[model samples]
Target: GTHLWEFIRDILIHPELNEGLMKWENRHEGVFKFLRSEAVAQLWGQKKKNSNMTYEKLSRAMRYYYKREILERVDGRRLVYKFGKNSSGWKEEEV
Candidate 1:
C-alpha cells in the first residue's frame, strides 16, 4: 500500500499538481480520516468475501510502513494516518 500512501499525499498535500482532481471534506489542517473500506477494496483487490477482511489486510499493510517512516497513525478517537518525514520532498511523478 505504499503507492496508496503516496497517492493520498500528492492529492492532499500538493494540490497544485492535482488541480481539481480531488477534494476532501471535514479534513483538518494536515489530518484526515483513513481510507474507507470500499476504497481499500478497490485499490488492493476484493479477494475476500467479507469487507472487514480487506480492512484488516489494509491495516496490516500499513503497519509495515510505520517502522519504515513512510506513514504513521495519529493518536485520537478516530483512525487517522499521516505521512512521515520520508515524504517531505515526495513528488507525484516519482510514483
Candidate 2:
C-alpha cells in the first residue's frame, strides 16, 4: 500500500533499478528525470504485479505523492521531477 514513492526512490538509489529507466538530474538536489516514461510505467507495472499499467496512471500515483510531500513539481520540462521537502535517503551522503 505504501510502496509507490518508496518504489520510485528505490530505483533512484539502486543503480540496477535505475537501469537507464531513470536518472538523477541533480544528485545533490534530489531532482530526478524519467528516461522512458512509458517503459518505466511498464516496469513499475511489473513491480506492482500489473501488466497494463499506463504512464498516465502511474503519473497519477506520483501526483498523489505531492500531497504527501514525497515529491516536488518540475514544470516547463519533460519528465523531470524533484523530491519533496520530506523526501529522505536521496542525498549523495546517504549511500
- After superposition, which runs of candidate 1 have C-alpha atoms over 4 Å from their true positions? 10-29, 46-53, 88-95
Q: Where in model 2 is the C-alpha error above 4 Å? A: none
lDDT of 2: 0.83
Q: Please, what are the lDDT tens digits per residue for candidate 2 over residues 14-81? A: 88746698898998888888898888899789887899998899989888888888898888978898
RMSD of each: 6.1, 1.8
**Model 2: per-residue Cα lDDT at residue 69:** 88
Residue 68 miss distance in model 1 (angstroms): 1.0
What does candidate 1's lDDT look like per residue over 1-95, in tens digits?
24656655555655575444334333333444543554644444443344454556666776687788876556753546666656553433443
Residue pairs in clash, model 1: none
- Largest TM-score belongs to which candidate? 2
Candidate 1 lDDT score relative to the true structure:
0.53
